[PDB]
Write a structure and sequence with these properties.
Chain D: It is a peripheral membrane protein. The structure is cut from a larger assembly and holds seven protein chains of seven kinds. Chain F is low in regular secondary structure. Chain F contains no helices and no strands. Helices cover 14% and strands 23% of the residues of chain G. The chains are: A mainly alpha, B alpha/beta, C little secondary structure, D little secondary structure, E alpha+beta, F little secondary structure, G alpha+beta. The structure holds iron/sulfur cluster (2 copies), FE2/S2 (inorganic) cluster (FES) and zinc ion.
Chain lengths: 114, 688, 123, 71, 84, 38, 208
């Protein structure tokens, strides 16, 4: 498709990029974990980062892989600074929300027709 | 080559020699406003709200009835037309009293969506307004005749399609009423369908009478199953409940018309209904138990029985997706001996190739047909839209009719040929005439029902009638192919419940004593507990409680026809999928999801979960149930014409009779009808 | 200029949540409410989703609900451009078909007839 | 089940009821054919609507108005 | 057990499948003139690979195919399972 | 007539705070099972 | 007709025919359509290429000043096959007129910032990145304005069901103010207002 790409060209400089800002996240999880005075096992903070970057795996295209970045490149602005107050962060790890069954026969006794 | 060009608003368009202005000016996308003109009816001239203005002639014509000659300039929008359509619709607001707060059509009416857009602004009268008086017809049509813009669209309809000729025009001058001179109540099928016709709020529906106004509802298309032709309906939902249902204007089945029974029967849907599972208890005790509890109660009891001792029979309106999950499950324990509640006599066919098993020439075939002979049925009260799809074609062009047995009241001039099974045979050669008339017929047709086919000699009449179809078809027999012999059912879901391969007729249980049955039938008085052996248990499954709710072991709920995305079939073998509307009440659940949670808690676990993994299974076991609404070319009754001649059985002797005669039994029949409390109002206004 | 042609079937991911694969949308031509004869409510191919449970709220009887879509109707202009928006946003769907009447043949003045069977009285 | 909410709260309900308060009216008569039902005083009340009383004995009170009306 | 049932799927056109259509001309009236028990099923259209299907032994599905054959090739292809 | 005699107030709990309820008839009318006999 | 109907004025409609005739004359590499709104306003349909270019011509000249940028905005149309739209809106202080500049786009195709031409598209471009999702390259800054820090949906486009996907509520089980999926106390009734008969003949869509 003819439209100018954003940053990358095909898939390599692109997949050099996603490798890159990983470390900015990987090098800085914990400085926050003492800064907000939020308490968690610092390794959790390194599981989620690696839990997300493995999530969107099937992407076939440039200008998508550049699009996601422009989001991801942002967040390091807010989080590495303090523009969030504890409660824009911890929302990643959902503490309160009761589990979903996701199995079959556990559904059939609770809830209609999902 | 036979067409005219005529310029509508300065634009050329082609029109067949003899279409009116209105059918031309529709082709380019305009509505001349309409009051007395309507497609499916005839045409008369007495609204005078379509005045088109022709080019270069001082008079103003009317665009309902008048042909269109070599090209006029048909000028819709000028300063001449706009001098009329403003000057009529200030007349018919002279007397139209000050309802609309409360006139129950107050959200659709056509003294409203004309007379803002087209026509006037304020009024100059200033004093007047006759008010006549109403009366009553029946416990459906509610009648305030104070309104009546007097299109005369309710009258040309009685003498037209539904053949009952009653309504009339009584009077002269400013005063003429409409309703009937004497006190006769006017009651029939399809004549509960008027209240689509009347363009203003004269005729408005009784049970619905005051509940909701029609900007609030939600139109979710659906399909009506109480009967063969199906429909295309549309439901409505206010708060999450059903309010009222319409037709959906399909172009073959339900021209614009929906029958009456399928309309006023939503009412027993929310009345008496079973909202939970109910355990067994040993006594007359029957109680409610948690959904996990009475599931296993019947789970283990399957690990006991085996072989033909466990057989299920489902004869009712059940879907075509709970006719697999139940078939594959009870057939993976290898116990079948299963049938439906219905009775289809079989000899050398009745499943294979089907060819005789469904109505061959579709509904849309009748329009072309020439000679018709139908036997052993009263087509009026079963498939009421196959009747008047004769009537309209009996008129509008010539058609001939003959019936066999028990002359009933139909709407058109037929003739009773003879009454007995023994008449059919002598018509093989010349006797008891037609003799050549079926023979000389260009497109003969023959229709056998499910009432006559259900006798104990049944496999004979199937084979006796097929002969006369072979008799003719082997000559030419039509032109041409033009299939002839065909059947019509009266039962909701059968052609699905059968051509899946479920053997016809309840016999296979009648020979032996199987211990554990599943009743989806379920309310026929066929199988009782007395007929069963000892108390070994039957598990009822279904939504209602009618008969077979008490006589049963453990029951399980279900969703009706408005709550589930299912697949039905009508008697041309289409596939129509009803669509979700309300979500089912209390604890009840869908049927084919109550199978798989019967399976996994027991031994075998069927190979699917979601819906699309049901229909792929529907796709293996049958190819055409996933082809929605297409009639594929099949004849294939040659090879079954001979093979069903195998058995030599001969008839009984006894005059044919239909179950339904004149009316009163039309209402309470299937399930929902029986519990519908408004039918309970119009059954006692019949007897007396 | 960096024109860089390629072909990857357009899809988009992550913005909604689980409602990507759970549901089935539907593309259908509205049917004309039949209590009135106005033919102008047709002509646009919309889409609307499946309906999930509305229950009762045990204080008043407002029927409160989840299923946060439940009320959207987009309006497209045609079929070729209809399916265009289900794939490009990546969820399942289904299709209906448009309907228009027979031609048809209606002539006043055939209502008074010598041997014809169509002859009206009290029209 | 539901009934534990207004415990001690005294449960406001409507002392009068109009379910039928109507029938106490001295159902009027005219001596003519059709009438003007504008109620409750001029230009406060239902829109003017004319009703026909010719039956034998009945009337018709227009249904906005409710007030039993006849000859 | 088996077997139990036999489902001959076919297509209305794409004549490459015509053997089945021809098979009915050839062996149906004759083939099922015996076996007055088995309920052979003709259903309509798989449009492609008119797979013959058969079911037995507690509902296990066994699907042979056919794509372009002659008349008698299938007549002998049926007794493959039917003898068993 | 059709209007009061004395008066009332807006009170916080009087004891009577009126605490509204639902004004409607029932909905689906569940089924009754059959009695003592088999 | 006079008393209640808005009296028209012709002069304003003659010139804005001319002065807009020839900005399809001197920049034909870009401008692909132009017209005159019956109320005496102009709409210039421009390819997405010229954005910085065309304005820059509109930025200064002695025959067209258009120094004052008033309103940048957007519209998002499905079944336009290129979703969104831009509309620039510019007032020329000397000549007393309004001329609007329409430029289409998609989500994926970037558009180039106008920021060096006017410094008042600084905010109006930060916003749109939040709402519709259009991505403006080479912008001195790109961030999140008008929206919270959680909205991953880009609302104002036509796929966001009005109530967003997560209601908020505070619970004392710990400290925080946390987010649970949206559960309403009333349906948000959907009424249906669209009446038949096509009251407008002039706008009559093609016959087809
Ligand atoms: S009936 Fe038709 S006209 Fe009479 S009030 Fe209701 S809408 Fe207005
Ligand atoms: S019903 Fe109302 S409209 Fe239909 S004909 Fe009788 S009066 Fe004229
Ligand atoms: S519409 Fe003109 S005659 Fe009825
Ligand atoms: Zn009154």
């Amino acid at each position: 498709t003819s439209v100018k790409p954003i940053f990358s060209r095909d898939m390599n400089e692109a997949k050099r990029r996603v490798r890159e800002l990983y470390r900015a996240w990987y090098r800085e999880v914990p400085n926050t974990v003492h800064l907000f005075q939020l308490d968690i096992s610092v390794k959790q903070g390194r599981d989620k980062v690696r839990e997300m970057f493995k999530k969107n795996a099937h992407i076939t295209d440039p200008r998508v892989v550049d699009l996601l970045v422009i989001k991801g490149k942002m967040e390091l602005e807010e989080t590495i600074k303090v523009w969030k107050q504890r409660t824009h962060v911890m929302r990643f790890f959902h503490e309160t929300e009761a589990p979903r069954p996701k199995d079959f026969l556990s559904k059939f006794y609770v809830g209609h027709d999902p | 080559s036979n067409l005219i060009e005529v310029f509508v608003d300065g634009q050329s368009v082609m029109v067949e020699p003899g279409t009116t202005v209105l059918q031309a000016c529709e082709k380019v996308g305009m509505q001349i406003p309409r009051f007395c003109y309507h497609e499916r009816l005839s045409v008369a001239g007495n609204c005078r709200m379509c005045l088109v203005e022709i080019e270069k002639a001082p008079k103003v014509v009317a665009a309902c009835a008048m042909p269109v000659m070599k090209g006029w300039n048909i000028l819709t929008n000028s300063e001449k037309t706009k001098k009329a359509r403003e000057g009529v619709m200030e007349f018919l607001l002279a007397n139209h009293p000050l309802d609309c707060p409360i006139c129950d059509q107050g959200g659709e009416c056509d003294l409203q969506d004309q007379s803002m857009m087209f026509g006037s602004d304020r009024s100059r009268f200033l004093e007047g307004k006759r008010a006549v008086e109403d009366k009553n017809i029946g416990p459906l049509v509610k009648t305030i005749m104070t309104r009546c813009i007097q299109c005369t669209r309710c009258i040309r309809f009685a003498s037209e399609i539904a053949g009952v000729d009653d309504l009339g025009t009584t009077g002269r001058g400013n005063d003429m009423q409409v309703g009937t001179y004497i006190e006769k109540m006017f009651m029939s099928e399809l004549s509960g369908n008027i209240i689509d016709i009347c363009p203003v709020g004269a005729l408005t529906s009784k049970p619905y009478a005051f509940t909701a106004r029609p900007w609030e509802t939600r139109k979710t298309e659906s399909i009506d199953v109480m009967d063969a032709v199906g429909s295309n309906i549309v439901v409505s939902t206010r708060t999450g409940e059903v309010m009222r249902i319409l037709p959906r204007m399909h172009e073959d089945i339900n021209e614009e018309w929906i029958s009456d029974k399928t309309r006023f029967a939503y009412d027993g849907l929310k009345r008496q209904r079973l909202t939970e599972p109910m355990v067994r208890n040993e006594k007359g005790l029957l109680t409610h138990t948690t959904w996990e509890d009475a599931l296993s109660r019947v789970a283990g009891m399957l690990q006991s029985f085996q072989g033909n001792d466990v057989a299920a029979i489902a004869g009712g309106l059940v879907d075509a997706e709970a006719l697999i999950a139940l078939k594959d499950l009870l057939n993976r324990v290898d116990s079948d001996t299963l049938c439906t509640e219905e009775v289809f006599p079989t000899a050398g066919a009745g499943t294979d190739l089907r060819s005789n098993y469904l109505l061959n020439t579709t509904i849309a075939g009748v329009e072309e047909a020439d000679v018709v002979l139908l036997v052993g049925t009263n087509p009026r009260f079963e498939a009421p839209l196959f009747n008047a799809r004769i009537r309209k074609s009996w008129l509008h062009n010539d058609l001939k009719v003959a019936l066999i047995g028990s002359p009933v009241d139909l709407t058109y001039r037929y003739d009773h040929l003879g009454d007995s099974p023994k008449i059919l045979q002598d018509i093989a050669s010349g006797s008891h005439p037609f003799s050549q008339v079926l023979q000389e017929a260009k497109k003969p047709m023959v229709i056998l029902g499910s009432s006559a086919l259900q006798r104990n000699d049944g496999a004979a009449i199937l084979a006796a009638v097929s002969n006369i179809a072979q008799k003719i078809r082997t000559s030419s027999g039509v032109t041409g192919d033009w299939k002839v012999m065909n059947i019509l059912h009266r039962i909701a879901s059968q052609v699905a419940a059968l051509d899946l391969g479920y053997k016809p007729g309840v016999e296979a249980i009648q020979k032996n004593p199987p211990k554990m049955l599943f009743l989806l039938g379920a309310d026929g008085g066929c199988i009782t507990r007395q007929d069963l052996p000892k108390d070994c248990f039957i598990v009822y499954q279904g939504h209602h409680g009618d008969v077979g709710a008490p006589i049963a072991d453990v029951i399980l709920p279900g969703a009706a026809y408005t709550e589930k995305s299912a697949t039905y079939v009508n008697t041309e073998g289409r596939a129509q999928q009803t669509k979700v509307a309300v979500t089912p009440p209390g604890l009840a659940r869908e049927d084919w999801k109550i199978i798989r949670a019967l399976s996994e808690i027991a031994g075998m676990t069927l190979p699917y979960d979601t819906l699309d993994q049901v229909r792929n299974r529907l796709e293996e076991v049958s190819p055409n149930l996933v082809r929605y609404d297409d009639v594929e070319g099949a004849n294939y009754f040659q090879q079954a014409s001979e093979l069903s001649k195998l058995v030599n059985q001969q008839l009984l002797a006894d005059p044919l009779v239909p179950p339904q005669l004149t009316i009163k039994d039309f209402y309470m029949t299937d399930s929902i009808s029986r519990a519908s409390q408004t039918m309970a109002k119009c059954v006692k206004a019949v007897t007396e | 200029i960096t024109v860089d042609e390629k072909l990857d079937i357009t899809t988009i991911t992550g913005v909604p949540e689980e409602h990507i694969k759970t549901r089935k949308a539907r593309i259908f031509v509205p049917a004309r409410n039949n209590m009135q004869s106005g033919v102008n409510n047709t002509k646009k191919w919309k889409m609307e989703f499946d309906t999930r449970e509305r229950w009762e709220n045990p204080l008043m009887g407002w029927a409160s609900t989840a299923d946060p879509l439940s009320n959207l109707v987009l309006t497209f202009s045609t079929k070729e451009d209809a399916v265009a928006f289900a794939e490009k946003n990546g969820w399942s769907y289904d299709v209906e078909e448009r309907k228009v009447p027979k031609p048809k043949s209606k002539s006043y003045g055939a209502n008074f007839s010598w041997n014809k069977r169509t002859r009206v009285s009290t029209k | 089940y539901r009934k534990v909410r207004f415990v001690g709260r005294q449960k406001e309900v409507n002392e009068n009821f109009a379910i039928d308060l109507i029938a106490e009216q001295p159902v009027s008569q005219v001596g003519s054919r059709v009438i003007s039902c504008d109620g409750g005083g001029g230009a406060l009340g239902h829109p003017r609507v004319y009703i026909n009383l010719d039956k034998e004995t009945k009337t018709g009170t227009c249904g906005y108005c409710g007030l039993q009306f006849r000859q | 057990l088996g077997l139990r049932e036999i489902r001959i799927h076919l297509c209305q056109r794409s004549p490459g499948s015509q053997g089945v259509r021809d098979f009915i001309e050839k062996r149906y009236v004759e083939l099922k003139k015996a076996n007055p028990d088995l309920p052979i099923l003709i259903r309509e259209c798989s449009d492609v690979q008119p797979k013959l299907w058969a079911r037995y032994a507690f509902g296990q599905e066994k699907n042979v195919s056919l794509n372009n054959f002659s008349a008698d090739q299938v007549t002998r292809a049926l007794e493959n399972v039917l003898s068993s | 007539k059709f209007i009061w005699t004395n008066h009332k107030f807006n009170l916080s709990g009087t004891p009577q705070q009126y605490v509204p309820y639902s004004t409607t008839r029932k909905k689906i009318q569940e089924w009754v099972p059959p009695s003592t006999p088999y | 007709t006079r008393p209640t109907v808005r009296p028209r004025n012709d002069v304003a409609h003659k010139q804005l025919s001319a002065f807009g005739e020839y900005v399809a004359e001197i920049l034909p590499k870009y401008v692909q359509q132009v017209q005159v709104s019956c109320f005496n306003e102009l709409e210039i349909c421009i390819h997405p290429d010229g954005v910085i270019p065309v304005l820059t011509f509109l930025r200064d000249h002695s025959n067209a000043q258009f120094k004052s940028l008033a309103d940048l905005t957007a519209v998002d149309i499905p079944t336009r096959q290129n979703r969104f739209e831009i509309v620039y809106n510019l007032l020329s202080l000397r000549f007393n007129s309004r001329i609007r500049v329409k430029t289409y786009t998609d989500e994926l195709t970037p558009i180039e910032s106008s920021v060096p031409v006017y410094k008042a598209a600084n905010w109006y471009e930060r916003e749109i990145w939040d709402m519709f999702g259009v991505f403006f390259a080479n912008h001195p800054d790109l961030r999140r304005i008008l929206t919270d820090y959680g909205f991953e949906g880009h609302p104002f486009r036509k796929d966001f069901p009005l109530s967003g996907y997560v209601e908020l509520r505070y619970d004392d089980e710990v400290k925080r103010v946390v987010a649970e999926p949206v559960e309403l106390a009333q349906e948000f009734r959907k009424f249906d207002l669209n009446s038949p008969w096509e009251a407008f003949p002039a706008y009559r869509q093609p016959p087809e």
